[PDB]
Symmetry: C3
Subunit: 251 residues, 3 copies
């Protein structure tokens, strides 16, 4: 399976598992993440989510082939279900970033609660290098999380951060040796899952309630511009340039 799932000690562990494609997110994986996060809200015996990935990468971003598949989905697109499920999840989420977190690998962290990283973790949101724009309301949430200057160094200039730089900016709050990241993140998730459940749920609701409506509105504003860029010559050329091993040209 592309998403490994286990449930113990009232923690739902979700492990992204396509190490062959550097844990690139496709339709199937988005659908499965959405399914599990929705499950967490409705089961009162699920009190924390631990999210991580197998191997040396957290995720390399959107799967390219699956990104540009002409065959449109039945019903709501899986990426949209995922963004809605993670942005509205009532359950506290601990995320353990085990390696490079690129694009949607970075932006999904803004909707997690406890954000921890290994020393080998890296972070990038290079929307401009591919000719696209911020998604998952990161145009609102990234500056709130790290300030305007870090947010622009990431989103406009395409900077890659290491784990220590992410910590100093406040994007992550703990950095562990690679070999203990998961065990230490699980210990924290288990502790949260053992606390008074309504206390935790209400506390998160109060915290997330401040920007809840603007988060949904910003995803729609970004989405319109994103769709337009995805279908434009600028996207084609950014992508073609990389595969043709040349500098992109924009007249």
């Amino acid at each position: 399976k592309s998403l490994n799932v286990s449930l113990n000690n009232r923690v739902l562990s979700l492990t992204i598992n396509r190490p062959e494609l550097k844990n690139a997110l496709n339709r199937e994986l988005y659908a499965a993440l959405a399914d599990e996060l929705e499950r967490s809200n409705h089961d009162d015996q699920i009190r924390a989510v631990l999210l991580t990935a197998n191997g040396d990468t957290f995720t390399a971003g959107n799967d390219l082939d699956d990104f540009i598949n002409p065959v449109e989905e039945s019903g709501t697109p899986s990426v949209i279900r995922f963004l809605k499920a993670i942005s509205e999840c009532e359950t506290p989420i601990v995320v353990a970033v085990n390696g490079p977190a690129i694009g949607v690998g970075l932006t999904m962290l803004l909707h997690c609660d406890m954000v921890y990283a290994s020393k080998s973790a890296r972070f990038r949101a290079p929307f401009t290098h591919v000719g696209l724009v911020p998604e998952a309301a990161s145009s609102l949430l990234l500056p709130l999380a790290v300030g305007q200057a870090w947010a622009n160094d990431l989103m406009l200039a395409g900077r890659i951060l290491d784990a220590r730089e992410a910590l100093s900016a406040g994007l992550v709050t703990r950095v562990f040796e690679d070999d203990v990241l998961v065990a230490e993140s699980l210990k924290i998730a288990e502790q949260v899952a053992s606390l008074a459940p309504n206390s935790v749920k209400q506390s998160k609701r109060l915290i997330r309630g401040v920007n809840k409506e603007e988060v949904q509105a910003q995803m729609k504003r970004e989405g319109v511009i994103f769709a337009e860029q995805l279908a434009s010559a600028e996207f084609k050329e950014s992508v073609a340039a990389f595969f043709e091993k040349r500098a992109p040209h924009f007249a």
Copy 2:
């Protein structure tokens, strides 16, 4: 007295003084803090407040006995007067955190202006460990102050920060050796008190004016949920578990 007060060089020095109970806040102390902060607004010759505490602790949080006293107060509860007085204080406040600042010891700092700490200072807002929720509008202000990731590591996971971690997160901006914290904080308070008074008052008004209304609204939203949790089985059990030296159980 539980609050030592002096006035010199146009600085009102407020020193919390219940070292026997680790400077735990009770009704009397809240009332006295409220009285002094209100005085600061109305006296034009009081131009800065220096807030600190005696001994090795800044404050251990709410006094438990006084917290759950069935005998209700006459008029407005002292904690409410305090939160209103500190959130609306027009006078600049320098706070020198001399040791552990727990619960309301942490959240009151979000309503101070200059936030300084000793090397022995520690910071915690473990609302979830006691089965409660954020107060004093910290569900809004804590993420603004340190970002979403630090704010959740504090409020949901119950993390304890040392002084250097608080500095790196931006919760405090200076860390001093214990034996000079107070003298160095007073020097800064005296300098501010010697500046053009309307310049300082208006500058603070502009800064605080951005979230002024949302701060009051958020305290009311938090307050309803807080009262409900305080009277619930989850609070009883969280507290009983600690005193009975056992793991809490929430079905």
Copy 3:
């Protein structure tokens, strides 16, 4: 000229050049900066701005003589044109802070995108030491950028930050040796200027769109109070005190 301008590789390089007065901003310089930033919006072949200054200072703030010139300007004051042009600039701006950035030298950075500094850079916004109030919407933007505690240590207490402290607070995101700051900042500006132009422009629009309207409203609120302080006894006395080599007295 007081502003050196060059255009190469689709980067408009703007270098503030009054090293004789420590790069103090006067009417002429504001007008020239406004002219160039407006040019950047309307020329599709200008895709990044690099802003820096000659010598050992970025800017010492407002030119005092020019500040209090009784002869009023024809049309819109140059400072207002500049603040409007930089706050609404559609072009990404890389700013390389080569030395002390004082007052408007600090606040203009909140409207730049990529904020980089030399090791000799220093930062100060001492509005209260001169009897004035925050400008250029820094009463809103500074706390968003660095948190409430850093913002107050700057604006109320008049703290001077070095480059490493600015980095740790997130006001700047890179610190370079003095002798490479400009070359490294230009390399980044050139890279941004080579990316898909609508991708970059829209990305910045989404990021800046969140606070765009409040930034303009806050400049007007600050402006009214500022004008009042500038014409008051408090300003006269703050300034006179410095020149008369004495402590200011405010009854």
